[PDB]
Design an enzyme around this catalytic site. Structure first.
Site, PDB file in Angstrom:
ATOM      1  N   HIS A  55       0.872  -1.131  -0.150  1.00 50.13           N
ATOM      2  CA  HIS A  55      -0.064   0.126   0.083  1.00 50.13           C
ATOM      3  C   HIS A  55       1.170   1.251   0.012  1.00 50.13           C
ATOM      4  CE1 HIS A  55      -3.306   2.434   2.237  1.00 50.13           C
ATOM      5  NE2 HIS A  55      -2.818   3.299   0.977  1.00 50.13           N
ATOM      6  N   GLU A 129       0.998   8.010  -3.150  1.00 53.47           N
ATOM      7  CA  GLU A 129       1.923   7.343  -2.126  1.00 53.47           C
ATOM      8  C   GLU A 129       2.718   8.241  -2.658  1.00 53.47           C
ATOM      9  OE1 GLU A 129      -1.034   5.883  -0.589  1.00 53.47           O
ATOM     10  OE2 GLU A 129       1.127   5.663   0.052  1.00 53.47           O
ATOM     11  N   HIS A 133       3.187  10.388   0.937  1.00 52.59           N
ATOM     12  CA  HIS A 133       4.470  10.423   1.930  1.00 52.59           C
ATOM     13  C   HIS A 133       5.635  10.445   1.492  1.00 52.59           C
ATOM     14  CE1 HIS A 133       0.988   8.470   4.253  1.00 52.59           C
ATOM     15  NE2 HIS A 133       0.969   8.372   3.393  1.00 52.59           N
TER      16      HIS A 133
END
Ligand SMILES: [Ca+2]
Length: 245
Positions: A55, A129, A133
């Site tokens: 993920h 993502e 992040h």
């Protein structure tokens, strides 16, 4: 290679987020969400552990960011988009392909794709993502996603991965899951894991593992983890969801 931050590197951990893909798909379905190719294209696989997919890899709250008033919850909600800093554009799940292309190499993209069904294509999970992040840390996308792939593989090959495979479609207890995780990494590291479930009875949808930032570039060992406060919402027992709705 080695994952390194170029800015805001003063965080102490990374949370490796691994989806139990079958459960993720089951959840999307139970909540009445339109099916993503990921799930309708999802089939049974020989190695059940391969349903444990990537993920993301989420850096913890950097001290430099917390210093400016950002708390843990705000960092969790917006990541690189938190204000006053890093203040990068907000990555949205409703438009993951709208986030910047990551610049990931074709080779890393190929490796990433085999363990992150949502990457590329018309899903662009890796863009989202990275935007949320990794961009604010200036991470090399290849080292970043390459590291996620490796860590996921190490988890799948451990007793935790074998536990999921051996109990595919069965109801397991958190006690036994913890015993399996502990068999490979130590009892004191069971606290580094947060499990997420959906439904009632509960079925597994995600495994989040807290890893020391200092140990991120080395093979996982009993010295690589950090305890964290949240066991998750799975309860005492839960089902290792099988492919199919
Ligand atoms: Ca299912």
């Amino acid at each position: 290679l080695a994952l390194q931050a170029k800015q805001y590197g003063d965080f102490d951990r990374y949370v490796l987020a691994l989806s139990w893909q079958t459960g993720f798909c089951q959840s999307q379905h139970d909540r009445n969400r339109n099916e993503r190719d990921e799930c309708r294209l999802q089939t049974e696989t020989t190695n059940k552990a391969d349903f444990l997919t990537v993920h993301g890899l989420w850096p913890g709250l950097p001290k430099s960011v917390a210093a400016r008033g950002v708390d843990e919850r705000r960092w969790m909600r917006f990541g690189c988009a938190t204000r006053p800093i890093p203040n990068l554009p907000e990555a949205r799940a409703s438009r993951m392909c709208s986030s910047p292309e990551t610049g990931l190499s074709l080779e890393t993209a190929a490796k990433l794709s085999e363990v992150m069904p949502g990457a590329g294509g018309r899903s662009c999970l890796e863009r989202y993502e990275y935007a949320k992040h990794g961009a604010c840390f200036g991470f090399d996308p290849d080292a970043y996603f390459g590291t996620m792939v490796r860590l996921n593989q190490e988890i799948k090959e451990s007793e935790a991965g074998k536990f999921l495979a051996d109990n595919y479609g069965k109801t397991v207890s958190r006690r036994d899951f913890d015993a399996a995780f502990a068999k490979s990494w130590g009892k004191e590291n069971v606290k580094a894991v947060k499990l997420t479930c959906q439904g009632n009875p509960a079925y597994l949808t995600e495994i989040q593992i807290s890893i020391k930032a200092d140990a991120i570039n080395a093979p996982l060992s009993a010295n690589s983890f950090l305890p964290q406060p949240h066991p998750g919402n799975c309860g005492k027992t839960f089902v290792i969801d099988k492919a199919g709705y």
